[PDB]
Design a protein around this ligand. Structure first.
Ligand SMILES: O=C([O-])C(=O)[O-]
Ligand SMILES: O=C([O-])C(=O)[O-]
Ligand SMILES: O=C([O-])C(=O)[O-]
Ligand SMILES: O=C([O-])C(=O)[O-]
Ligand SMILES: O=C([O-])C(=O)[O-]
Ligand SMILES: O=C([O-])C(=O)[O-]
Ligand SMILES: O=C([O-])C(=O)[O-]
Ligand SMILES: [K+]
Ligand SMILES: [Mg+2]
Ligand SMILES: [Mg+2]
Lengths: 501, 501, 501, 500
């Protein structure tokens, strides 16, 4: 049984060994990274079903990121299995500043009047909270009376009741009892702070990642196609045209502009952390189902992200709600499910990947009956689309163990994946960029091979590689799909039904 | 635009020139057959859309039939297009005798009480009507009081009121005003006169046709599967196992046994002439629609026959009702529509074929919308069936100009035809028997090609043949289906969707 | 077992006894009309299943028409059943004139060069054919060179090769062997001869019919909504605004403007006679099916007309093609089928109505399985639509014997009819004008009653009237529908399912 | 905008004021019950959308349960809204015993060898854990080597490696690091401990609850139809035949016999607490979805229960996963969602009801598009079924603000509810047992009225009440359904589509 739903795991110190010490142990950080020991731990995550690692450039400098990418490349060799490399941008983050007097935090009561500063490069005081705004932008003219400033995963609400021109301060009322600590995330929902389409820091971070070697970029807080297009231009300028871009939908602007964002991007990450603060809490499931439906209809990749197994950061078992959440993301139609803190800085990273894999596997068993995606509704605008629809029908009518496609660019594999056939998809391709680039498509098992010389060669290759991989045995029926010749599926395509000898 | 519904045209003297004379001219039967001039007239029928010629063994002698079949082979070279050869059996007949005084006929009025004699070899009087029963069978014990004796295309009814065992006569009541003329057809519905399953006459005709080279046999008055199986036995005995049998459904027992008869036969001919006498006149459309539905569900051939354009025997234009009848047979799902006296004996054989072809082409354009048949009900149980379903869906999703099947036996062409794709079906086969055997399947264009060589590309050959025949040109999309490799005895396993060069 | 599909029978001399003579007996026309003997004949046509009588104003003076309608009014009292009264207009007919020297006809051969005169009031010669044009219109400028003049049901084609300004004659070439007899229909298709939207003759005829009392008008050669609108105006101005107009579609312009004609009209008459001459003969079935679908979708009345049982004009039994034509109009979804010459001018008027009834009743039994109409497509606008759809479902879900509606205007009967429930529709109504106005709606049995006093009253009346008509007995389930109060279903309507006690 | 998905809230000390002391105060149990102040707190739960109160007979004695039910009777009066009363049985619970020397708990490491005693009425030690088995059953012969004993919501596993015939103890290996505390839940999945169909303790609790007046019984650990029928016997014998029985499905036997249990019962409670310990944790969603589908198909009531907003027991905000969990239970086709510890003994009982109401309201808006249930599949074999199918189509075809049913038994409300019309369902009934008995059916607003005077009267009543309750105003389209002649207990056979 192959896991069809792909897992993105975020990496961090949780899997990393430093001087024989594990994360949280006394004097962990006083020790150099043990690359081999760390690489062996990361390999266990690959074996447990991680299909792509997320390097979150919100935390850690370039040397820390570059070192973690080098450790994953060693982990691939150890696992004898390849994974995708995904860079997640910092983007236009607002954080609380450091306090004067090195205070760590203060407690506030409902009804207190305090201020939020807009001046940059300054410290907070108990009564005047300063912001670290991405690119040191001045936000005073961008936030209107009646707006909400939310601190620390949306837990503490501050209502803007007046603005002070003299100090460029928001006069706010504490809406609920709570704590403001230093370096915590801040959200100001329903505003249009003019963060640039691509900030210098993100530009630098992307260029560094492209230099190291990546497959994917998840662009934080995408509001318009322009946020995607400015990243696409750098990928193209640097000869990294292979890189796929996932727009993170994290706020009302991104939801409002979803259609143009899907058009410009290679897929969507449903960033439920910022989204669950930026829109009403009970709307998140509506937006989750709507986004999965539209990305699937576009033949693109959707990643369902954030707090999926949150309790497993601290505890060895998920909650019943967390199991339901992961399971329903699969039934919704998600290509991939993501771990963030659970794999990056929790006590149980391998157990979190194992629990996600188990839920994802149990849920794929119910897609034929309960799946919310509806491939019958899709218009077939090309022969490769009508062939993918045919592959689906053949897997519904016959007991088909496996679909095998030979694909130069991944195009046939993506279209077959779009239709969600009740079969695994072995995608044979001829370069490592296309191979790693398919690792987040539903059901796709990418495998590197030599390009075939003829057509009849191609059907033999397809059956031999499937047999060598242990996906099929003598007497199993497979569906083989290729362009004729390979790479030309837009002009001429073929589907064969083959009994394995 | 190619006509998908097949036309069966009955041949007879209407197209035959004898020493420069036309049928009905003085001294016609005095001249010898002008074979070249007659073949030129038959070639015009082929060009106008005849796909199979019917040789009606109810009339003529074997020499006339063999000669006519040779005239057709010459016509095929003139038209550059082959047709199917169908033999229609005489079957069992009952005819009114000659009268004493050699009176031609008598007029009767409702309520008149008269007699029908069962004794063979006597003459009719006004008061006592004598019958010529096939085989001189004594039918006395087979017709009960309350049965109906019908005379002359069922235009005059005699009700059996009493039986006189002394004279073995039927005491009957004239039910309606009508004529009883000499040598007119008699029907006695809902009786089981023990006509043999295979009469000596039909044995002689069938074996003669088989020796000449026929593709189809239409068996008159099929009552049970035994009536089909006795003809199947002759085909098997003689090494003519490729010959297809169409059961003619003409009476109530045939309708009652329709399911077992379809299973035994290769197809049905809906014999509306006798059927319209043997069942209530207003029920024929019910049985026509029911038979077409059952035969399409069985994957077999149905022919709608008799009096489709009957007024064109004597007039240059059909009636509105005849146009409707032909049109609605197509909508009902018929493979083929038939001409009898209109092509065989009438003043306008060419015009009759042209009119039927025009009506059939106009109706096929409505099949996507108003089509009676529903391909969605078929069970995809085989490789060939799922592949035939794929073809249908490709043709429903894209503008497919042509479906090409490389078929040793014609099985794949028959399965694609059943699905009624919105495309012409080119069936490339490797022997003349298989090619002619496909001539009545809806939408199928049979074509003979050289058996594939080890180094032949079947797919390139398929496209090239379709281009040369003028069915497709550069930029058209076609579907090609084949059993790879080398069209062995390997089930169809491959579908290509191809933009034509 | 109630006949759901309605019959229009055209009246004429065929049913009229004159001085004890039947039509076509010697000296028939020399005798005065026997009103008692003629009414007894017409009453038999009612018992047989005629629902409406067509008075064709193309033939007969007002005195002949008036005596006929008066015969019909007497007929109902003999029958004890009412029927509808339909007036059909001469409209813009062209005819061949009388020939000089009392010659009845001439035969022509293909290639012959002759002339057609445009001057009115003159007689034809063999070499110069003269036209009787409606309202004595000059057509010389309104038909161009290359146009076709067709004589006698479009049997003989004359091709216009030149126009002679000096004589205002067409030089025409005979296109095929044929006869030009006196006072035969002439058609000049794809022309725009400026016939008034209403002609004084048609104005006058309509006003006469209204004085006698007509339920419907059929308007010949309707080209646009304009031709319907002018007839509407007269019906209102005379206090006859209750009169339903059927537009006759007979030509390309009527088909091209069908949507606007359907909007203005209450219904459509498919005039297959002129239609089959004015458009391609073999395309009539396409237009028939198309028109019936569109008129059902608008909730209006469609009549399939002309040559449905044509051979029964001369013979006591229809052809197989005629039986198919009637049967398939019912499957197409027609509300009504029509007899013209067969009931007006034929030897077998009563047998023609009996035959059409038998076929119609047989075909209605197949509507569930084979009905071409699709009630599921209709957008349920009003609550009246959704009530109608609900009644349809109740009759699909359970064994409903009958649907009873209490309707002031008939509007609930019209929407229930539109949905073609698997049940007879008893429409209880409160005047004779509304009750006859429903006689061409599919499945509707009109019945006069006095208005209800209470709601409990309205439901007890529906059931009592039903048991009294013999339509239902004890144990039969019926659906009752109504406005509350009766006749306001537009705002507030009710459906009840009741077992008869 | 009315909440169609029903809410069951468990009642407990969290809403109850003792003297002036809230729950978790210093010497809270050191006071009497402030009944009026408690009833005013419960009234706030009714206002926020609690449709039924659950009285969990696992915790408390008859006196505590009795007083709580009486406080609820007061809250209804304060709220001006009635609610259902549901008794939840203790059932065949296994718990850990009190410890030697009043020890609260001990912590264990993987691989540790210890013993579980089957002997009843003894204290636990660190090395030998004793069990408080319902009915004091000796379970020794019912658990084979290789079975698993689980403690505290299945958090700590013990693997039976051997059986000591001399002491009737299990030799177990600690499977994972964890804590054994006193009086914690114990599960022994995939065993057939011969607990009776109905234990004397459950018999007694049910009879006491029947005495106080209840609408529903939730039967813990239902294995077979016998477990339901033996409770039905008592509701019948005592003249409490109005009481509806929810089988709680929370072990493999329940799942295996689900069809026969649905047949015997009035509805199902999906008890995901025990169910997630008794079956593979990551399989609970499969059984939830299957159970909801089978119970809607039977036109019965399904409650999705346990840990739906768990974190709100201690925090003011639910997690993203908990929002997703409640939302998808609605999408799955649940009639009702439940709160246990969140309403019964947490810090935020009112905010818990409010959050569930908000998610449930938002989810019902997506049932027309993403709804799991499929009503086209139901057999239309009756006049009532045909009428219910006709109501659903009216609400699909038209913007219908409300369906009003005049129902003596509620049968017509239940059938209409089965079809999940896109509209609220006002159920006008003539006694208080029918009224309260409808309060867990999807979309049904029950309301008491006098049996009507006539057909015109009945249709007039229906509109007036709906207008009074503020459900609809002038220009609104409603569907009214009734059986005429009116009041004669006629099967519904009339539909009216009416502009108000
Ligand atoms: O950025 C994220 O992943 C989020 O906000 O969920
Ligand atoms: O997938 C591909 O490479 C194609 O388009 O043939
Ligand atoms: O034999 C036939 O074809 C018939 O009777 O129609
Ligand atoms: O058509 C054929 O020969 C086949 O596929 O069996
Ligand atoms: O006028 C007519 O009825 C016709 O042309 O069919
Ligand atoms: O049928 C009627 O007259 C009505 O109720 O609209
Ligand atoms: O009893 C319960 O409600 C449970 O176990 O979930
Ligand atoms: K006319
Ligand atoms: Mg025959
Ligand atoms: Mg439990």
């Amino acid at each position: 049984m192959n896991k069809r739903v792909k897992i993105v795991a975020t990496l961090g110190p949780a899997v990393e060994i430093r001087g024989g010490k594990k994360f949280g142990e006394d004097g962990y950080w006083g020790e150099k990274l043990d690359v081999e020991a760390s690489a062996k731990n990361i390999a266990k995550l690959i074996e447990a079903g991680a299909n792509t690692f997320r390097f979150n450039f919100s935390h850690g400098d370039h040397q820390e990121q570059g070192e973690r990418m080098a450790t994953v490349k060693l982990a691939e060799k150890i696992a004898g299995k390849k994974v995708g490399f995904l860079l997640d941008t910092k983007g236009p983050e607002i954080r609380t500043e450091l306090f004067e007097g090195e205070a760590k935090e203060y407690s506030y009561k409902t009804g207190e009047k305090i201020r939020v500063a807009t001046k940059q490069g300054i410290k907070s005081t108990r009564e005047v909270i300063a912001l670290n705004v991405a690119g040191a932008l001045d936000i005073y003219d961008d936030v209107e009376v009646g707006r909400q400033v939310l601190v620390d995963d949306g837990k503490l609400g501050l209502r803007v009741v007046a603005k002070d021109d003299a100090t460029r301060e928001f006069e706010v009322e504490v809406e609920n009892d709570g704590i403001i600590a230093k370096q915590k995330g801040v959200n100001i929902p329903n505003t249009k702070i003019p963060f640039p389409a691509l900030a210098e820091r993100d530009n630098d971070d992307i260029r560094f990642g492209l230099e190291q070697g990546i497959n994917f970029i998840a662009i934080s807080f995408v509001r318009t196609a322009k946020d995607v297009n400015e990243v696409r231009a750098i990928c193209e300028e640097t000869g990294n045209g292979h890189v796929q871009l996932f727009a993170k939908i994290e706020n009302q602007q991104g939801i409002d502009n979803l259609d143009e964002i899907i058009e410009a991007a290679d897929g969507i990450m449903i960033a439920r952390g910022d989204m669950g603060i930026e829109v009403p809490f009970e709307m998140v499931p509506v937006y989750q189902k709507m986004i999965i439906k539209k990305v699937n209809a576009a033949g693109k990749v959707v990643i369902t992200a954030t707090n999926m197994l949150e309790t497993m950061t601290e505890k060895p078992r998920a909650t019943r709600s967390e199991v339901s959440d992961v399971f329903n993301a699969v039934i919704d139609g998600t290509d991939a499910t993501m771990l963030s803190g659970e794999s990056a800085n929790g006590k149980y990273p391998l157990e979190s990947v194992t629990t996600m894999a188990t839920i994802d596997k149990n849920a794929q068993a119910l897609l034929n009956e309960y799946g919310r995606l509806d491939s019958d509704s899709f218009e077939r605008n090309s022969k490769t689309e009508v062939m993918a629809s045919a592959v689906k029908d053949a897997t519904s009518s016959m007991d088909i163990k496996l679909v095998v496609t030979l694909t130069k660019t991944g195009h046939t594999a993506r279209l077959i994946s779009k239709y969600r056939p009740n079969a695994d998809i072995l995608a044979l391709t001829f370069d490592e960029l296309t191979e790693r680039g398919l690792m987040l498509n539903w059901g796709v098992i990418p495998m590197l091979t030599d390009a075939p010389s003829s057509t009849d060669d191609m059907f033999e290759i397809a059956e031999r590689k499937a047999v060598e991989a242990g996906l099929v045995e003598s007497g199993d029926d497979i569906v083989i799909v290729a362009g004729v010749p390979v790479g030309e599926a837009v002009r001429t395509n073929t589907m064969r039904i083959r009994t394995v000898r």
